Amino acid sequence: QMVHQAISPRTLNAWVKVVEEKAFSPEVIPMFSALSEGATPQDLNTMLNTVGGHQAAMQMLKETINEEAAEWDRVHPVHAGPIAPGQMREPRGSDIAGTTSTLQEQIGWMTNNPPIPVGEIYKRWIILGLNKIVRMYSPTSILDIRQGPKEPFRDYVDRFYKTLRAEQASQEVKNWMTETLLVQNANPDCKTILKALGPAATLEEMMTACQGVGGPGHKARVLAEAMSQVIN
Amino acid sequence: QMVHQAISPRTLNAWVKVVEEKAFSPEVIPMFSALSEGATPQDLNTMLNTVGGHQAAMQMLKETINEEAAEWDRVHPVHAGPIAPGQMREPRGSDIAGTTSTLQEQIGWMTNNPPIPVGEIYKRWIILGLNKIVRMYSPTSILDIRQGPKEPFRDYVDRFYKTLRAEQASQEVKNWMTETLLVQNANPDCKTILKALGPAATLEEMMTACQGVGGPGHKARVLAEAMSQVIN
Amino acid sequence: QMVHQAISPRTLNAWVKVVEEKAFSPEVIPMFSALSEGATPQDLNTMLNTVGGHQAAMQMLKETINEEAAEWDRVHPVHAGPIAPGQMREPRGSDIAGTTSTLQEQIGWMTNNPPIPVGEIYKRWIILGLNKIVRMYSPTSILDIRQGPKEPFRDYVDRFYKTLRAEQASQEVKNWMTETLLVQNANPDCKTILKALGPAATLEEMMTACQGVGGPGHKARVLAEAMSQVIN
Amino acid sequence: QMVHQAISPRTLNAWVKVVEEKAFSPEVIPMFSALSEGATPQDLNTMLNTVGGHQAAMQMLKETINEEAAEWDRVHPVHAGPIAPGQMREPRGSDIAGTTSTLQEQIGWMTNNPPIPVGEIYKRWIILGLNKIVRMYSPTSILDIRQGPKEPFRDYVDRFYKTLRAEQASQEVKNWMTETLLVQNANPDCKTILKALGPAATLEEMMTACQGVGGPGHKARVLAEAMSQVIN
Amino acid sequence: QMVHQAISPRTLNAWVKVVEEKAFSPEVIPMFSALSEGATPQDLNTMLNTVGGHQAAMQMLKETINEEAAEWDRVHPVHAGPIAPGQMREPRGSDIAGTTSTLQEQIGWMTNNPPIPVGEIYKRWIILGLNKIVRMYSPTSILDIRQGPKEPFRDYVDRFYKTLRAEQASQEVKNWMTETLLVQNANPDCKTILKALGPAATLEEMMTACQGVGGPGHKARVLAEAMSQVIN
Ligand SMILES: CC(C)(C#Cc1ccc(-c2ccc(Cl)c3c(NS(C)(=O)=O)nn(CC(F)(F)F)c23)c([C@H](Cc2cc(F)cc(F)c2)NC(=O)Cn2nc(C(F)(F)F)c3c2C(F)(F)[C@@H]2C[C@H]32)n1)S(C)(=O)=O
Ligand SMILES: CC(C)(C#Cc1ccc(-c2ccc(Cl)c3c(NS(C)(=O)=O)nn(CC(F)(F)F)c23)c([C@H](Cc2cc(F)cc(F)c2)NC(=O)Cn2nc(C(F)(F)F)c3c2C(F)(F)[C@@H]2C[C@H]32)n1)S(C)(=O)=O
Ligand SMILES: CC(C)(C#Cc1ccc(-c2ccc(Cl)c3c(NS(C)(=O)=O)nn(CC(F)(F)F)c23)c([C@H](Cc2cc(F)cc(F)c2)NC(=O)Cn2nc(C(F)(F)F)c3c2C(F)(F)[C@@H]2C[C@H]32)n1)S(C)(=O)=O
Ligand SMILES: CC(C)(C#Cc1ccc(-c2ccc(Cl)c3c(NS(C)(=O)=O)nn(CC(F)(F)F)c23)c([C@H](Cc2cc(F)cc(F)c2)NC(=O)Cn2nc(C(F)(F)F)c3c2C(F)(F)[C@@H]2C[C@H]32)n1)S(C)(=O)=O
Ligand SMILES: CC(C)(C#Cc1ccc(-c2ccc(Cl)c3c(NS(C)(=O)=O)nn(CC(F)(F)F)c23)c([C@H](Cc2cc(F)cc(F)c2)NC(=O)Cn2nc(C(F)(F)F)c3c2C(F)(F)[C@@H]2C[C@H]32)n1)S(C)(=O)=O
Ligand SMILES: C=C(C)[C@@H]1CC[C@]2(C(=O)O)CC[C@]3(C)[C@H](CC[C@@H]4[C@@]5(C)CC[C@H](OC(=O)CC(C)(C)C(=O)O)C(C)(C)[C@@H]5CC[C@]43C)[C@@H]12
Ligand SMILES: O=P(O)(O)O[C@H]1[C@H](OP(=O)(O)O)[C@H](OP(=O)(O)O)[C@H](OP(=O)(O)O)[C@@H](OP(=O)(O)O)[C@H]1OP(=O)(O)O
């Protein structure tokens, strides 16, 4: 037969925009519940594959799906023997998840009498994964990258640029983030030097200027400055 | 047959109260999805017709529904004509939306074997529309009606009263809104005159007092006052 | 037959965690609808019985379910006559709610041809109840217990400890709550006395110290001190 | 038959990441050319539908595809006469674009003898559209929203918030953008007032303070201050 | 047959409330012993699945159950051959715990002649696990999160918020904990700066103010302050 509730172009685009705009806020759960309703496991897998970024969250979701597939296998014993020509093989957990089943097999299960709603079972597994992601997963934010009090400036710059590469933004916005946040979120010892450097300093000049922060000479110099302030 | 999941009086009232209390915040999407499950397209249309105000949002929803009906028609080719006497005509997008189908026809599709869940397909279309509304539609608010720096006071009053007529509130709250926000949200040039006029001033008196703001006489008078302050 | 959408261990645990973490915030409505889909009324009742605390909310939910069951009974007239041996009895509202139906009967209704999705009907009833709870139910909070201006300190302490017993917290957190909030949220008249007592004062000492607040002696003493300030 | 070059989950995810990371820089053209080679028009349409945002760009692509389909229809004259039972209908432009053709028909055209590579023809059409997008389409940027010299502060705030809603960023990043760019990109006349307000000022306070900029009172006041400097 | 001592709704709710109120104080052991008496392994598994939080404790309980099942398998040799039609398979350790057995099999074992009380055997295994939890498991407490003498403020804040997410409390109580405990439980070096910041400081301002504690400039400054106190 055919699946009447196969996802339309606008449904898939709406799911993509939901993920892009809300990330994994709780609102993702009702949206996925409504957009994916009635769809085959193949359509749900398409929706899950359209998620860009958030690799850790998607790995969490995959682990949850595997656990639910194992639970399905535990609750459904394997039947050994020759299947009737009219009948078809009973779904397994991987068949529900669509890893070992074709679209035709999923449609056959969904439209059989009695029907096995493999799409809705898979949808509940995905919802469990999404709930786990919403509770536990925190996406990396370029706004959260601050230099540690004893962290070398080079290591902080490496962390900043790694997070910026992972950041969801336009390239112009990422350039503006580099121009604003990097010096702003440095630790005070490095920030003093960076401000003394001036606004026109390049990244290499900034990195050379802070290369000694925490070394013997810089420590002695700041200690001597503080002691001179005290004596005066 | 009969639809076991037809909307109850409490279900319809809950949907009405959801729309009235939350407008089109994201919470409207789960509630609708929960409140309309297993209902016919007729019940869904009844739920949609109970939305008071937000006419622009309802128009956006209608456009989304029409687009989804067109997609359904594209995916489902029409038949040649030999309809089986026992069988019924296959639904079109308009039939899914309930514009060209009766309640009996929708029930027949829903309870047929194999079943066509016309209600659930229509629900998915309505959810797509509601998502578009939540993302893109902003209801007019009496709170953000402010007089422009060069806007005539009469035009501002007309805008304020149009928004107030569109506002969801009781008549007493609307009167209090008129007494409070109209003078508060005027521009400084008109606001000074209104303050000098006194609380007892009526709408006609305020409008007459502010009729000359921005004209040559008022501009000359304010410029002369500023010049006199400068000279002194 | 067999129900393929029976709640798994992780589904039940997710529902328990949702109720514990979110109480009855609106997020409870989508989560329930997602976790409970396809389940029998028995699984729905299991989830409902897993709710610890919020007894008034659960009474509201029960009242809503009874009203929906009455609506179902009104809509479905009871038919007199012996049921066919192949057929089963038509469900009543109590049967959908699972009070008067066994799991076997629920599964038979859900997997019959034509099917009666008693699980989905009951789910919508529970959603109506949950929506009513979210709208109208506010859980008691230990943070909200504050001594009235003329309330005896003993009555305030009784209310505080009752609310603390109802509070969802660990014993250590409850002890810290007692150490912090009880004196903090006392009225000024008792609060000056409690501060004068000192940090080491026990509950009995605090209750004895404030036992006279509002009595003729305390009123006369505070009036005398105020008059001393005035005539100073 | 079957299509061996159907897009894999990783191929689709790579396309999604390309669009999210590069927007429509020229690099999109090689990536799309390489990721979509040998795919059916259905897979191509899926990839096109996973593009979030850039609605004007997608409309441009749709117009280019429609014009290429019209060119195909011009070049290939529709032949009148029943098709051979072994043969299949020749594809039209809409068939290559996938609007009026099913996946089975596309596979039949691609795997026929002689083959009609509808996937590759559609790929070239999409590449033409993408080239037009890369040359002529500029995405909106929140960094580009600056208040005009005579623009009311209300209108500038409206434009800023519309562009921010359209911006591809996390909610925290959008909040930081509101905190940073709105006052920064205001015109000098509003900017001096906003600075005088202080950092703690809310949006409504900022919007009330600038409500009179450009009005007769503000014009007179600034002219008076300038004349005070001159005649000093 | 049927299990006469299947857990009632009130039994399950009482178990949930026991775990919520008491966590894993020794009182859990008698309560579980009394609530679960006579129940099938399926019912006990339900009770264990209703435990929210304490995931480490539940993992310990699962390990104890697995060890007891292994001991059962060691003591009960596997019998190979054709089971009598009137007889059922002898239970294994996994069958006692209900992982590889169905409710029907458990009821058959429990009601057979001679009976195998699989529920009570499983109950003793669970009691052993609960005893191990009571002796060894210590739940995380937000009250126990204190900043180390050399710990960066950002790391301490991250630990605090992780523990707060795991804490059993209402959201309002968690907000109160954030407003009270975080500054209170910081180390003295950070607490001095935080107190100098003021009561209205946000989390970002607090993190910025302590970003340099332990860095060279801060160390020099505090050493200079101490030396100045000594010289004076
Ligand atoms: C052809 C088509 C119709 C199809 C299909 C199709 C078929 C099956 C599956 C699949 C489903 C369930 C499981 Cl449980 C496993 C599995 N279990 S396993 C042995 O442990 O790995 N493997 N698969 C791969 C399988 F089946 F091919 F083997 C799956 C997918 C998933 C959908 C999915 C994506 C996701 F993110 C998280 C999920 F839980 C499920 N997509 C992938 O898995 C590829 N992926 N994975 C991960 C990650 F690791 F981060 F989670 C990532 C991707 C990514 F999308 F690139 C993206 C960056 C993230 N799609 S179409 C048009 O969509 O292309
Ligand atoms: C008999 C009965 C059970 C029925 C039915 C019934 C049947 C069909 C439809 C309908 C459904 C879908 C489409 Cl797609 C079209 C269509 N497509 S079209 C060619 O472009 O216009 N037309 N219809 C009219 C049709 F079918 F009659 F032709 C429809 C409605 C809609 C329900 C609906 C309301 C809505 F807000 C938005 C929707 F998307 C759908 N209600 C209307 O449409 C009337 N409406 N419209 C608009 C607006 F334009 F602002 F959105 C407004 C109304 C309003 F309610 F007054 C309210 C102020 C807003 N109800 S009942 C309840 O009466 O007793
Ligand atoms: C055996 C099993 C499979 C089962 C079942 C099972 C079967 C039926 C029902 C039931 C369902 C619907 C109605 Cl409408 C009535 C009814 N209508 S009536 C004549 O007016 O009272 N009675 N019942 C009892 C019936 F059926 F026995 F008669 C019900 C329950 C409910 C589920 C439920 C819980 C709830 F909170 C609110 C609900 F709306 C429904 N649970 C109870 O009712 C016991 N309960 N009640 C209340 C309260 F009063 F606060 F709401 C409280 C409990 C509590 F859980 F302790 C908790 C503190 C709160 N469970 S299992 C594994 O789960 O144990
Ligand atoms: C079921 C499935 C296999 C399929 C399919 C499927 C089938 C066909 C088409 C399609 C292809 C070519 C043309 Cl030439 C037209 C057409 N020509 S016409 C009469 O002038 O409009 N109509 N269609 C709709 C048709 F065919 F239904 F009629 C098409 C699509 C396009 C793919 C596409 C996307 C795109 F962005 C630009 C394109 F050029 C083509 N997707 C849509 O069209 C929906 N869309 N449109 C636009 C816009 F208008 F902005 F461009 C937008 C969308 C959006 F994705 F939401 C996104 C925000 C942007 N997908 S699956 C798993 O992928 O869902
Ligand atoms: C359908 C139904 C009747 C049933 C059943 C049902 C059937 C079996 C089991 C089970 C029992 C014994 C073992 Cl010895 C194993 C096993 N041994 S193994 C190969 O090493 O992992 N696996 N199982 C899963 C099995 F059998 F399905 F494979 C089990 C469970 C357990 C009950 C249980 C919970 C628990 F906390 C600790 C236990 F010791 C036992 N529930 C789970 O296990 C799922 N779980 N696990 C863990 C953790 F890992 F943290 F401990 C957590 C959960 C959680 F509940 F989510 C919660 C957060 C914590 N329930 S119902 C109405 O209740 O849903
Ligand atoms: C004779 C006098 C009493 C005094 C004594 C000497 C004097 C002085 O020192 O005070 C020299 C300066 C002047 C001439 C004043 C008179 C007033 C004028 C005036 C206020 C006149 C109104 C004019 O305004 C416009 O044209 C309106 C405007 C918005 C610019 C438009 O139309 O585009 C401007 C240009 C703003 C001038 C500035 C110069 C001065 C101060 C004189
Ligand atoms: O629009 P504004 O900037 O607020 O000022 C305008 C405008 O001056 P601008 O050139 O700065 O825009 C007019 O144009 P100019 O003559 O100065 O070039 C001017 O005179 P005209 O209208 O005769 O051209 C006069 O306009 P008005 O006659 O209405 O006073 C004036 O004041 P307004 O703001 O009130 O328009």
Residue numbers in the entry:
A (entry chain A), B (entry chain C), C (entry chain Q), D (entry chain B), E (entry chain P): 9 to 240
From the manuscript:
The Gag polyprotein, composed of MA, CA, SP1, NC, SP2, and P6 domains, is the sole viral component needed for the assembly and release of an immature virus particle, which is accomplished by the oligomerization of Gag into a lattice structure at the plasma membrane. Cryo-electron tomography (cryo-ET) data has revealed that the immature Gag lattice forms a spherical cage of interconnected hexamers where the CA protein plays a critical role in stabilizing the spherical hexameric lattice before the viral protease cleaves the Gag polyprotein into its individual subunits and maturation occurs. CA is composed of two domains, the N-terminal domain (NTD) and the C-terminal domain (CTD).
Utilizing PFO-treated VLPs, we obtained two BVM-bound immature GagCA-SP1 structures, which include: (1) a 2.10 Å resolution structure with both LEN and BVM bound to T8I VLPs; (2) a 3.09 Å resolution BVM-bound structure from NL-MA/NC VLPs. Despite the high resolution, the density for BVM is an average of 6 symmetrically placed molecules since the GagCA-SP1 lattice is six-fold symmetric (C6 symmetry) while the BVM bound at the symmetry center is not. To better interpret the averaged density, we modeled six symmetrically related BVM molecules inside the cryo-EM density (left), which was then compared with a surface contour generated from the symmetrically placed BVM molecules. This led to accurate positioning of the BVM model consistent with the “up-orientation,” where the dimethyl-succinate group is oriented up towards the CACTD. The succinyl moiety is in the proximity of the K227 ring, which appears to adopt alternative conformations to interact with either IP6 or the BVM moiety (described in detail below). A structural comparison between the GagCA-SP1 model in complex with LEN and the model bound to both BVM and LEN showed an RMSD of ~0.4 Å (right), demonstrating that BVM does not induce any additional conformational change in the LEN-bound GagCA-SP1.
